[PDB]
Design an enzyme around this catalytic site. Structure first.
Site, PDB file in Angstrom:
ATOM      1  N   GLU A 124       0.856  -1.199   0.000  1.00  0.00           N
ATOM      2  CA  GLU A 124       0.000   0.000   0.000  1.00  0.00           C
ATOM      3  C   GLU A 124       0.892   1.249   0.000  1.00  0.00           C
ATOM      4  OE1 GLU A 124      -2.917   0.268   3.165  1.00  0.00           O
ATOM      5  OE2 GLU A 124      -4.057   1.807   2.098  1.00  0.00           O
ATOM      6  N   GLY A 265       2.887   2.573  11.590  1.00  0.00           N
ATOM      7  CA  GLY A 265       2.661   1.599  12.646  1.00  0.00           C
ATOM      8  C   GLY A 265       2.537   0.156  12.145  1.00  0.00           C
ATOM      9  N   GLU A 268      -2.295  -3.959   6.952  1.00  0.00           N
ATOM     10  CA  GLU A 268      -3.330  -4.995   7.043  1.00  0.00           C
ATOM     11  C   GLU A 268      -3.305  -6.078   5.944  1.00  0.00           C
ATOM     12  OE1 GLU A 268      -4.058  -1.765   6.129  1.00  0.00           O
ATOM     13  OE2 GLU A 268      -5.700  -1.697   4.632  1.00  0.00           O
ATOM     14  N   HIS A 301      -6.543  -2.276  15.128  1.00  0.00           N
ATOM     15  CA  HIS A 301      -6.790  -1.589  13.879  1.00  0.00           C
ATOM     16  C   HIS A 301      -6.572  -2.510  12.676  1.00  0.00           C
ATOM     17  CE1 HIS A 301      -6.635   2.065  11.167  1.00  0.00           C
ATOM     18  NE2 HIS A 301      -5.963   1.192  10.443  1.00  0.00           N
ATOM     19  N   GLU A 302      -5.429  -3.179  12.605  1.00  0.00           N
ATOM     20  CA  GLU A 302      -5.183  -4.028  11.428  1.00  0.00           C
ATOM     21  C   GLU A 302      -6.166  -5.189  11.361  1.00  0.00           C
ATOM     22  OE1 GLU A 302      -3.489  -2.341   9.579  1.00  0.00           O
ATOM     23  OE2 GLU A 302      -2.286  -1.200  11.011  1.00  0.00           O
ATOM     24  N   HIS A 305      -9.607  -4.048   9.924  1.00  0.00           N
ATOM     25  CA  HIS A 305      -9.493  -3.901   8.473  1.00  0.00           C
ATOM     26  C   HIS A 305     -10.015  -5.141   7.733  1.00  0.00           C
ATOM     27  CE1 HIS A 305      -7.902  -0.140   7.115  1.00  0.00           C
ATOM     28  NE2 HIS A 305      -6.770  -0.209   7.793  1.00  0.00           N
ATOM     29  N   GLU A 324     -10.157   3.839   6.138  1.00  0.00           N
ATOM     30  CA  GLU A 324      -9.292   4.283   7.246  1.00  0.00           C
ATOM     31  C   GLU A 324     -10.076   4.985   8.361  1.00  0.00           C
ATOM     32  OE1 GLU A 324      -6.599   2.963   7.691  1.00  0.00           O
ATOM     33  OE2 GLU A 324      -6.149   2.247   5.692  1.00  0.00           O
TER      34      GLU A 324
HETATM   35  C1  LIG Z   1       4.264   3.294   1.542  1.00  0.00           C
HETATM   36  N1  LIG Z   1       2.999   3.701   2.161  1.00  0.00           N
HETATM   37  C2  LIG Z   1       2.544   3.258   3.389  1.00  0.00           C
HETATM   38  C3  LIG Z   1       1.308   3.865   3.629  1.00  0.00           C
HETATM   39  C4  LIG Z   1       0.502   3.619   4.909  1.00  0.00           C
HETATM   40  C5  LIG Z   1       0.155   4.699   5.719  1.00  0.00           C
HETATM   41  C6  LIG Z   1      -0.543   4.456   6.893  1.00  0.00           C
HETATM   42  C7  LIG Z   1      -0.874   3.150   7.241  1.00  0.00           C
HETATM   43  C8  LIG Z   1      -1.618   2.929   8.533  1.00  0.00           C
HETATM   44  N2  LIG Z   1      -0.676   2.407   9.491  1.00  0.00           N
HETATM   45  C9  LIG Z   1      -0.836   2.630  10.809  1.00  0.00           C
HETATM   46  O1  LIG Z   1      -0.162   1.992  11.626  1.00  0.00           O
HETATM   47  O2  LIG Z   1      -2.052   3.264  11.193  1.00  0.00           O
HETATM   48  C10 LIG Z   1      -2.490   3.295  12.592  1.00  0.00           C
HETATM   49  C11 LIG Z   1      -1.408   3.965  13.520  1.00  0.00           C
HETATM   50  C12 LIG Z   1      -2.838   1.939  13.101  1.00  0.00           C
HETATM   51  C13 LIG Z   1      -3.784   4.164  12.602  1.00  0.00           C
HETATM   52  C14 LIG Z   1      -2.794   2.002   8.371  1.00  0.00           C
HETATM   53  O3  LIG Z   1      -3.852   2.404   7.880  1.00  0.00           O
HETATM   54  N3  LIG Z   1      -2.695   0.736   8.782  1.00  0.00           N
HETATM   55  O4  LIG Z   1      -3.840  -0.137   8.624  1.00  0.00           O
HETATM   56  C15 LIG Z   1      -0.500   2.066   6.448  1.00  0.00           C
HETATM   57  C16 LIG Z   1       0.194   2.311   5.269  1.00  0.00           C
HETATM   58  C17 LIG Z   1       1.012   4.697   2.550  1.00  0.00           C
HETATM   59  N4  LIG Z   1       2.064   4.582   1.647  1.00  0.00           N
HETATM   60 ZN   LIG Z   2      -5.571   1.292   8.364  1.00  0.00          ZN
END
Ligand SMILES: Cn1cc(-c2ccc([C@H](NC(=O)OC(C)(C)C)C(=O)NO)cc2)cn1
Ligand SMILES: [Zn+2]
Ligand SMILES: [Mg+2]
Ligand SMILES: [Mg+2]
Ligand SMILES: [Mg+2]
Length: 889
Positions: A124, A265, A268, A301-302, A305, A324
């Site tokens: 992603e 973080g 998913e 969170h994951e 999803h 999201e």
């Molecule tokens: C290379 N790239 C990576 C992304 C991306 C950005 C945010 C998440 C988000 N990661 C994250 O840990 O969000 C929390 C703290 C749980 C709200 C996400 O939506 N994870 O499901 C996952 C992937 C966009 N471009």
């Molecule tokens: Zn997410």
């Protein structure tokens, strides 16, 4: 720079039905062979077949086993592979390719990359095209058959999506594993992991169909003892989706994998969630308390999803908030239920109104569904996530739990096989709304404005009470400031959860009531209101708005003392503080502007100080809530209310106010710091990693907050407490001992002591770095250069870089030093970082987001550094686009 527009969505002229991958990992190269079983779609108009493919080394490409030749039948420019229409078949055909990539030098952590000794992918949003050729967009749904091979000794554990259907030996000490994942998915949900992974394991039996699910959590061998809490959180997540939403997991197995190098973080990927180690791994011995809520949140969170993102998918990236915002909302519900503390909701509001409100009044302002983008990586914002979650949460507020659950189930049952849009969700909610209001004429068409309109609404109030007729009125006005997205803002559907408090006895005067404000202004009248109430407005923070309650500080104090809603109590306290801050700020500003030899400051309201004392001394009051009321509002919340903010004057303002309250309450603070010790630092369950007590952790939060206040005030002999504190088994405590010792000559002694305690745990060391970084030290610039030379060095680990620099940027007095050297330092780090990781470089731009809100000198100093960064010949598209938007170019 290509700009994509939401209105321009069109389905592909092609279909990809099946993906068959062979990923052959070697020490200095990874060979990727891919067969794509393709078809011509009904939207085809004879166009060229164009694949995404970024940074790929072509060995060969074919159509129906016929080798293609470059120049004649295709072209590749390191971004797009174009196959000329005349050579593209008219019915079902097979496209194949073999490319070489290099995870070992992939420091951007997108596509396939090596994190320490683990090979891992992140796809992603647009990372799959860095692994192999594809029509890399989420509406291209396909089946996946994936084979991974690697050196057995270095990579004994091989993982991809779906079922492992074969494991085999390979001459030369290699082995392979084949994974077949027949259900359709978008390519951004593809993942692969290879490494010497150790695991913890459990079996979960689902609630209704009694399916056995294998749960695995993985890490490098050194940290396998930090996996237990994660597994408990996963179990908890699965149970919650079952209990609240009636939703069970649909696959046989779920893997969670931690890696040391990750941009965010976690991610998913279907059946194979991949985590920043700092959001999966913890032990009580080498994690601070925050890790436990963090892991609970990110694991939750994951998991959520799996429905909202993985089973119901996105048509296109403009729908990002639909997966999201909705998944953050689901995690928020989960975490509130798991923690059972009011500070859980308070902390999300605290973050929204500081960080997201700042973004929403910045030149970066966008609605939760934008109209355009350039770099997808810049799309993942606090607006899309956190305001998105508040928009999803408002549906629940409007509908109530029962009808919300009906609406949500309508959405899932209707779209479970397919892609969806924000409209689909609203539609489902609307069906619930019709049923609740009991007429099929009701509609939520106005609600869609929450998706399209940017900026924070302001909601203001006036009140009227007629003692004789027992009639109370709340007059309400809403306003959104015009911006670049809308010149004319429209009135939103704003749900206002309210109570009426009898100031005489503190009792509720009306039942649970949610005012539906749908106009620019309305008057809400209540009859049989026996006495003049104090209104309790936006309970639970029921809409993402600026609340202007127009209450007196006396009314606010009464709410703070006697109201039933945690948020309104906290907001009343916030509002009392803000009035004080704005007043003292202007007084300090004038003395500075007018170069006054003498002047007066308005003292902190004494009855307010009294109310703080009352709450602190209440043994029945919540410890987390207590830590909020003794803390001033965040700097980034305050800055929303001040034009041309002079950061020095704000720093002097805060100091004055803190000293005012401390001169009255320090003895109370000390008394509590001592009396909380026994329960806060109870070691009974210190060696039980599945025992997490959020109330106990809040008690520590309060102690560490009070110790900070007492240390800054140089309370008599507080250094004794600090030294004893450094001997505590809890990292939250002994790292606090480091930061509060900043005000004493023993700082560098505790610096060395705590470094020694931290250096052998990668994540703990990062927390140590944060602690040093945020230390209130006058020699903080010299300290940072020492961190650079002795600890950080040339690490490309985003965790290391973010730990050293981001906490420092929140040092109001020093980061904003008038020389601009703070700005210069971070801009240097952004440019350095941008060379190998554009996404994290853009994260490091965060302090610049408020640049046009500061005093005119500091505006200029920040603008100069941003323009310098913009002029770097090698600047990434990611960073350039971000800084262009931020500087209004
Ligand atoms: C290379 N790239 C990576 C992304 C991306 C950005 C945010 C998440 C988000 N990661 C994250 O840990 O969000 C929390 C703290 C749980 C709200 C996400 O939506 N994870 O499901 C996952 C992937 C966009 N471009
Ligand atoms: Zn997410
Ligand atoms: Mg159960
Ligand atoms: Mg314009
Ligand atoms: Mg490291």
């Amino acid at each position: 720079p290509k700009i994509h527009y939401r209105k321009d969505y069109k389905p592909s002229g092609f279909i990809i039905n099946q993906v068959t991958l062979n990923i052959n990992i070697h020490d200095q190269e990874t060979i990727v062979r891919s067969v794509l079983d393709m078809d011509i779609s009904k939207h085809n108009v004879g166009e060229d077949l164009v694949f995404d493919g970024v940074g790929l080394k072509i060995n060969e490409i074919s159509i129906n086993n016929k080798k293609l030749v470059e120049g004649e039948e295709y072209t590749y420019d390191n971004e797009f592979l174009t196959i000329f229409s005349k050579f593209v078949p008219k019915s079902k055909f097979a496209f194949s390719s073999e490319v070489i990539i290099h995870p070992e030098t992939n420091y951007a952590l997108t596509g396939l990359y090596k994190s320490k000794n683990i090979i891992v992918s992140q796809c992603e949003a647009t990372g799959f095209r860095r692994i192999t050729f594809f029509i890399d967009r989420p509406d291209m749904m396909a089946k996946y058959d994936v084979t991974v091979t690697a050196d057995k000794e270095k990579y004994p554990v091989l993982l991809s999506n779906g079922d492992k259907v074969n494991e085999f030996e390979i001459p030369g000490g290699r082995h392979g594993a084949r994974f077949n994942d027949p259900p359709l998915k978008p390519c951004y949900l593809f993942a692969v992991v290879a490494g010497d992974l150790k695991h913890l394991s459990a079996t979960y039996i689902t609630k209704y169909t009694k399916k056995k699910v294998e749960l695995y959590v993985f890490s490098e061998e050194k940290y396998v003892s930090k996996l237990q809490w994660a597994l408990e959180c996963l179990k908890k997540s699965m149970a919650f989706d079952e209990d609240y939403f009636g939703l069970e997991y649909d696959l046989s197995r779920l893997n969670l994998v931690a890696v040391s190098d990750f941009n965010v973080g976690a991610m998913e990927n279907k059946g194979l969630n991949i985590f920043n180690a700092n959001s999966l791994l913890a032990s009580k011995k080498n994690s601070i308390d925050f890790s436990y809520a963090r892991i609970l949140t990110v694991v939750g969170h994951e998991y959520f999803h799996q429905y909202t993102g993985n089973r119901v998918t996105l048509r296109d990236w403009f729908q990002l908030t639909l997966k999201e915002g909705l998944t953050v909302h689901r995690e928020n519900l989960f975490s509130e239920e798991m923690t059972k503390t009011v500070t859980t909701r308070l902390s999300h509001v605290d973050l929204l109104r500081s960080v997201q409100f700042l973004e929403d009044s910045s030149p970066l302002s966008h609605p939760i569904r934008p109209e355009s983008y350039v770099s997808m990586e810049n799309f993942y914002t606090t607006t899309v996530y956190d305001k998105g979650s508040e928009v999803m949460r408002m549906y629940l507020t409007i509908l109530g739990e029962e009808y919300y659950k009906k609406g949500f189930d309508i959405y899932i049952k209707k779209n479970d096989g397919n892609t969806a849009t924000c409209e689909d969700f609203n539609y489902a909610m609307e069906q619930a709304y019709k049923m609740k209001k009991a007429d099929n004429s009701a509609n939520l068409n106005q609600y869609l404005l929450w998706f399209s309109q940017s900026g924070t609404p302001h909601v203001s109030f006036k009140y009227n009470y007629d003692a004789e007729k027992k009639q109370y009125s709340i007059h309400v006005n809403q306003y959104t400031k015009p911006d670049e997205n809308q010149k004319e803002k429209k009135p939103l559907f704003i749900p206002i959860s309210v109570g009426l408090i009898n100031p005489e006895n503190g009792k509720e005067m009306i039942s649970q009531t949610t005012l539906e404000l749908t106009k620019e202004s309305d008057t809400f009248v209540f009859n049989n209101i026996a006495v003049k109430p104090i209104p309790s407005l936006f309970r639970g923070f029921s809409a993402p708005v600026y609340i202007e309650d127009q209450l007196t500080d006396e009314e606010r104090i009464l709410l703070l003392k006697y109201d039933s809603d945690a948020f309104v109590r906290y907001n009343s306290c916030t509002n009392i503080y803000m009035k004080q801050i704005l007043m003292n700020y202007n007084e300090f500003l004038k003395a500075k502007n007018e170069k006054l030899e003498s002047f007066q400051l308005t003292p902190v309201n004494a009855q307010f100080i009294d109310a703080i004392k009352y709450l602190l001394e209440d043994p029945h009051a919540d410890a987390g809530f207590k830590s909020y009321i003794v803390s001033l509002p965040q700097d980034r919340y305050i800055i929303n209310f001040v034009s041309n903010l002079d950061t020095d004057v704000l720093a002097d303002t805060k100091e004055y106010i803190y000293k005012q309250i401390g001169d009255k309450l320090n003895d109370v603070y000390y008394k509590m710091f001592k009396s909380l010790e026994a329960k806060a630092d109870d070691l009974t369950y210190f060696n039980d990693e599945s025992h997490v007590d959020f109330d106990q952790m809040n008690m520590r939060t309060l102690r560490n907050t009070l110790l900070s206040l007492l240390s800054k005030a140089q309370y008599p002999n507080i250094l004794n407490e600090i030294i004893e504190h450094s001997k505590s088994p809890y990292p939250s405590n002994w790292l606090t001992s480091l930061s509060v010792s900043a005000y004493f000559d023993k700082y560098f002694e505790l610096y060395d002591k705590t470094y020694k305690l931290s250096k052998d745990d990668e994540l703990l060391l990062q927390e140590w770095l944060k602690t040093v970084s945020r230390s209130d030290r006058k020699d903080i610039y010299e300290i940072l250069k020492k961190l650079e030379n002795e600890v950080l060095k040339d690490s490309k680990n985003p965790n290391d870089i973010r730990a050293v620099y981001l906490p420092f940027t929140n040092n109001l007095r020093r980061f904003h030093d008038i020389s601009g050297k703070g700005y210069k330092l971070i801009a240097e780090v952004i440019t350095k970082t941008d060379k190998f990781n554009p996404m994290v470089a853009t994260q490091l731009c965060e302090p610049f987001k408020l640049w046009n809100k500061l005093d005119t000198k500091r505006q200029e100093l920040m603008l100069n550094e941003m323009n310098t960064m913009l002029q770097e010949p090698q600047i990434s598209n990611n960073l350039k686009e971000y800084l262009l938007r931020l500087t209004n170019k």
